[PDB]
Amino acid sequence: DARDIIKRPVVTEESTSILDDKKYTFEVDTRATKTQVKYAVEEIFDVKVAKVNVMNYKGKLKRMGRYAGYTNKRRKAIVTVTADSKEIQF
Amino acid sequence: KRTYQPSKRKRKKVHGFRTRMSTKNGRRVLASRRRKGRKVLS
Amino acid sequence: AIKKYKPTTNGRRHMTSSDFAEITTSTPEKSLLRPLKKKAGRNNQGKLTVRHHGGGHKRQYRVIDFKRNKDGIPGRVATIEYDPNRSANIALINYADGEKRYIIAAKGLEVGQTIYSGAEADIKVGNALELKDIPVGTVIHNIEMKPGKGGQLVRSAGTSAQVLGKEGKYVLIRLNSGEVRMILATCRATIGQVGNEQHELINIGKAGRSRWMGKRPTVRGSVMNPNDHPHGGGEGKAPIGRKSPMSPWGKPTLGYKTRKKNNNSDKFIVRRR
RNA sequence: UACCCAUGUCCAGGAUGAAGGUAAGGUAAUACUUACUGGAGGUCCGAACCCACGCACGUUGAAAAGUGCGGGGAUGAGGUGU
RNA sequence: GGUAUGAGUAGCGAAAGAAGGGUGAGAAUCCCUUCCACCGAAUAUCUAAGGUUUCCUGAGGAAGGCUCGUCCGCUCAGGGUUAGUCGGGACCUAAGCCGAGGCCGAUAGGCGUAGGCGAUGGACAACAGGUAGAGAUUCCUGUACCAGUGCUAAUUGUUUAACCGAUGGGGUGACACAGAAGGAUAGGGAAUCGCACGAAUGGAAAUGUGCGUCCAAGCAGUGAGUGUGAGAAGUAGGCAAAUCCGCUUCUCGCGAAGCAUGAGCUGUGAUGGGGAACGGAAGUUCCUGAUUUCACGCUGUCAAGAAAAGCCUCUAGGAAGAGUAGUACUGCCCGUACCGCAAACCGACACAGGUAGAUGAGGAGAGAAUCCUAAGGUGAGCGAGAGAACUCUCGUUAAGGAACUCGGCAAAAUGACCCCGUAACUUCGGGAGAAGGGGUGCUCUAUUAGGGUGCAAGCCCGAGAGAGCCGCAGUGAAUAGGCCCAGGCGACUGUUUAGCAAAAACACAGGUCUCUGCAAAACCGUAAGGUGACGUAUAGGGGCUGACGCCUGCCCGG
Ligand SMILES: [Mg+2]
Ligand SMILES: [Mg+2]
Ligand SMILES: [Mg+2]
Ligand SMILES: [Mg+2]
Ligand SMILES: [Mg+2]
Ligand SMILES: [Mg+2]
Ligand SMILES: [Mg+2]
Ligand SMILES: [Mg+2]
Ligand SMILES: [Mg+2]
Ligand SMILES: [Mg+2]
Ligand SMILES: [Mg+2]
Ligand SMILES: [Mg+2]
Ligand SMILES: [Mg+2]
Ligand SMILES: [Mg+2]
Ligand SMILES: [Mg+2]
Ligand SMILES: [Mg+2]
Ligand SMILES: [Mg+2]
Ligand SMILES: [Mg+2]
Ligand SMILES: [Mg+2]
Ligand SMILES: [Mg+2]
Ligand SMILES: [Mg+2]
Ligand SMILES: [Mg+2]
Ligand SMILES: [Mg+2]
Ligand SMILES: [Mg+2]
Ligand SMILES: [Mg+2]
Ligand SMILES: [Mg+2]
Ligand SMILES: [Mg+2]
Ligand SMILES: [Mg+2]
Ligand SMILES: [Mg+2]
Ligand SMILES: [Mg+2]
Ligand SMILES: [Mg+2]
Ligand SMILES: [Mg+2]
Ligand SMILES: [Mg+2]
Ligand SMILES: [Mg+2]
Ligand SMILES: [Mg+2]
Ligand SMILES: [Mg+2]
Ligand SMILES: [Mg+2]
Ligand SMILES: [Mg+2]
Ligand SMILES: [Mg+2]
Ligand SMILES: [Mg+2]
Ligand SMILES: [Mg+2]
Ligand SMILES: [Mg+2]
Ligand SMILES: [Mg+2]
Ligand SMILES: [Mg+2]
Ligand SMILES: [Mg+2]
Ligand SMILES: [Mg+2]
Ligand SMILES: [Mg+2]
Ligand SMILES: [Mg+2]
């Protein structure tokens, strides 16, 4: 399903700075190929996707009182919609 | 020049899980570390 | 011919080399080359089983026609080439049907000569016949022991054997060693001494040149410790303080005969060397 | 770490001038001589690099084998990576 | 386990700092400015490994940091890594590893065939700009290429078979080392041109000073050169077949063409981009010149120098669809942060050690040496005084000059280039840089003579001599052999006791003895299977001796 592949939007100074450039940053399933992300975004948001760039983030090691461990590994997809395509809101 | 010149590949090829599994004595080692309850086999 | 190098260095001082006069090309036949990796005296267990081998120059194997099977069809000697894998030179034979093969270059084998193999071949140098067809007294090489197996016996540079007689289904050959033995008469041999007979005169000249040929240094038993060699140990130099000089593995190594006592081939040896 | 295997890679600069070749001579022809050419070598001098000869210092060290000043090899039986 | 003693003692880990300003509760130590100093074939720029968030921003100052601390590679929060083309995989194989059946073996297992895996190698399409707290050949802009896909349009084919074409054949792919001479281009430099200035202290409006003086892949042309006799018949081979390869014969022969390759150049790309100065000028000519490239191209040598895919071709096969043009669309996974001669890697440390590769400017120079600098980086995580003994690291030293000492150990001296000159002995190569001497700066004659470059203009290199001139001294600094006579040992270059021995020891070329007829002997293994060797007595194993020269006596009873 498409809403399994797209987890949640990414809201940061960086992610929010490129919304005007029609680039939408999502946290996507760690197994999702950029092709699956393209077709998922089109199904969910009714937009025309020009390109999808994708990057893997390894888990970040965090301490909390002599207990240490890794945050979740993340897969981040930046989805550029076409000029003619309607925007996604956030 | 000290002993211990690290190599990711050499570490797994000599001591890794699949190398341990590839021999009967290697499997004895895995069984022994499971018996002692090690967090890290291989 | 042997070229003697002038003593421009202590390294070159007594060194000699082939002039490679007989060699007619520096380029082997690409189709007849196979890769060859150095074993450096190591077994299929990876263990050193023969000492003093390792680290020579890289070599390609040339596939040699030791069988000389191609009966009736004439072969033109196209070139005499250097072969790093053996003491003899090799000759590229262009057969009239367009098959190319390498043979051991016999002494007197020239580019342009034609060679034949089989029952109708003349007793002319690089020709190959069954021993039953080869006259008594002929000088031969590349002698096969089992029919169709290929020549094994007299192949090294300058060597040659002589047909002595014909005793049943066996021919008597005097081998290069001076051993007289019986070869089955349907085995074939090539006519002529092998060639590159100057090969034994070469003075290697320097340690490094032995290293290029893949020979690592030999350490004498008498300068090892007693746990390494029967000659090991002793304060200062020691004589061989043993009833016999020994190999590194025990066993006497001066005069002690090692041919197996109950050997099947003993019936075919007429005179030991 | 030792030896080995396959596959890569490194070696500032300078010096010397082997064989061979060509041209003159030379001879019946050859040896041979001179000049030019040629560019050999576990060749020479010398950095990188590799080594570790002397001395000093260090000796609860900067270091569980180093540093400093000198030293040896430096196209090779060479160094080094995977 | 806690706590003493030694003791406020040793130590605080190679190094240059200074002041002013700021911040702050607090400042030698954080920030900024200026000057000073250090590295600069690195102490700079990339990048592999390795590390794994150390990266950026905002807070912090318990602990960590050998001092301090407002600061940090530390603590806490948020953030940050974008690819059809870069590297790896959806490609290829080497060593090696695994290995269906198989062979061998008390068990376990060992070996090995087909077949696989396996880079350190092969193949393979993207460049220049912009942007920035943190990525960038990845984002954006511009301009491309590679492989596909559909959709239009013509075109041709639809069983003497367009087209595709093997898992098969063949070619290529495909390779060492050394040397020499070239072409080109990077780089370097000088003028030119552009812009700015006109000056502190005696002088200068100019031979004045400062700064700058251009640009991709792709596409289309060209091109130093480098290789390469073509055509036709014909076929005991290339597991079948072949029009392909191989082989043979014949005709035509030439340093000429084609044909392949090929650095670079010229156009375009660019009305674009960048650029000394909120702005946009100049882009030229000449010299020098690679360690890069043409290119292992050429020549030579012996020690004789991967494979496979890929690509091309051939048939065997399969075939109604195929290509051409145009259009728009499609292109997955992994890595991408940051450190990377280092405080982030290996050394328990923020440790004088170790760490592959690419790049690595100028003057003088042969040079990557040396000294001083450029770009760029850095002032080294304790300081302030003092200027005793003593210790270490250095500099100088009257007269003497090895008297020191086991021993000239250490230090001193020598040192570069040019010229003169050079003995014994010798294996005729050497010895030899033997030894021992002499010269070396600046000015003028002098854009000298004479070279290189070029169409010129110019630019570069450049002796021998003559005159002169200064110093105690002219490779004025730094960096650069001490030498000789004679003897022992080892011929020689090599090798060795990681960490007290580098040697006369080992090795070595050479000698000799001996074994070994090939399923060799020898060696590993219970065996299979191996090495020997894809070798075959001019070969292989073992013992001893150790270049070369002259030699190598007697004894076979044990
Ligand atoms: Mg990616
Ligand atoms: Mg460790
Ligand atoms: Mg041997
Ligand atoms: Mg000993
Ligand atoms: Mg001993
Ligand atoms: Mg013993
Ligand atoms: Mg003894
Ligand atoms: Mg004695
Ligand atoms: Mg190697
Ligand atoms: Mg040398
Ligand atoms: Mg000593
Ligand atoms: Mg040193
Ligand atoms: Mg020397
Ligand atoms: Mg040297
Ligand atoms: Mg005290
Ligand atoms: Mg004290
Ligand atoms: Mg103190
Ligand atoms: Mg310090
Ligand atoms: Mg230097
Ligand atoms: Mg930081
Ligand atoms: Mg503190
Ligand atoms: Mg802070
Ligand atoms: Mg293999
Ligand atoms: Mg295989
Ligand atoms: Mg693979
Ligand atoms: Mg960055
Ligand atoms: Mg883009
Ligand atoms: Mg080849
Ligand atoms: Mg980066
Ligand atoms: Mg360090
Ligand atoms: Mg190193
Ligand atoms: Mg600077
Ligand atoms: Mg004095
Ligand atoms: Mg005096
Ligand atoms: Mg005395
Ligand atoms: Mg005295
Ligand atoms: Mg005395
Ligand atoms: Mg004495
Ligand atoms: Mg001394
Ligand atoms: Mg002299
Ligand atoms: Mg000087
Ligand atoms: Mg010696
Ligand atoms: Mg030596
Ligand atoms: Mg030692
Ligand atoms: Mg020592
Ligand atoms: Mg066997
Ligand atoms: Mg000896
Ligand atoms: Mg010997």
C224 strand E contact, CB < 7 Å: no
Q: Which ligand is nearest to the CA of C224?
A: 4
In angstroms, what is the span from residue A75 Cα to ligand 33's centroid? 82
Residue C38, nucleotide of least CA–C1' distance? D5
Which residues 18-47 of C interface with strand D at a CB distance below 7 A?
A: 37-40, 42
CB C187 within 8 A of CB C130: yes
Residue type at C75 in one-letter notation: G
DSSP-assigned letters across all residues of chain C: -EEEPP-SSTTTTT-EEE--TT---S---GGGEEE----TTB-TTS-B-SSSB------EEE-B--S----SS-EEEEEEE--TTSSS-EEEEEETTS-EEEEE--TT--TT-EE-BSTT--S-TT-EEEGGGSPTT-EEES--SSTTT---SS-STT--EEEEEEETTEEEEE-TTS-EEEEETTSEEEES--S-GGGGG----SHHHHHHTTBPPPPPGGGS-TTT-TT---SSS----SSS-EEBTEEE-SS---S-SS-GGGGGEEE--
Residue C207: CB less than 7 A from any atom in strand D? yes
CB atoms within 10 A of CB C25: 13
Structure tokens at C114: 């034609």
**Which residues in range 71-110 of chain C are in contact with strand E, contact meaning CB within 7 A of any of its atoms?**
72-74, 76, 82, 84-88, 94-100
DSSP SS3 for A17? helix
Experiment used for this model: cryo-EM
What is the Cα–Cα distance from C80 to B21, expressed in whole angstroms? Answer: 56
Which of C144, C158, C28, C21 shows the shortest CA–CA distance to C91? C28
Sequence letter at residue C29: E
**Listed residue (C128, C133, C230, C149) closest to C141, CA to CA:** C128
d(CA A37, CA A29): 9
Question: What is the stated resolution of the deposited model, in angstroms?
Answer: 2.3
Nearest to A72 by CA among A29, A36, A12, A15: A29
* Rounded Cα distance, A88 and C87, in Å: 81
C88 CA to E513 C1', in Å? 27
Domain ranges of chain A: 1-90
**C106/C263 Cα distance (integer angstroms):** 32
Q: Which 3-state string (H, E, C) describes B1-42?
A: CCCCCCCHHHHHHHHCHHHHHCCHHHHHHHHHHHHHCCCCCC
Nucleotide with the nearest C1' to C205 CA: E509
| Residues after which chain C is discontinuous, using a C–N cutoff of 2.5 Å | none
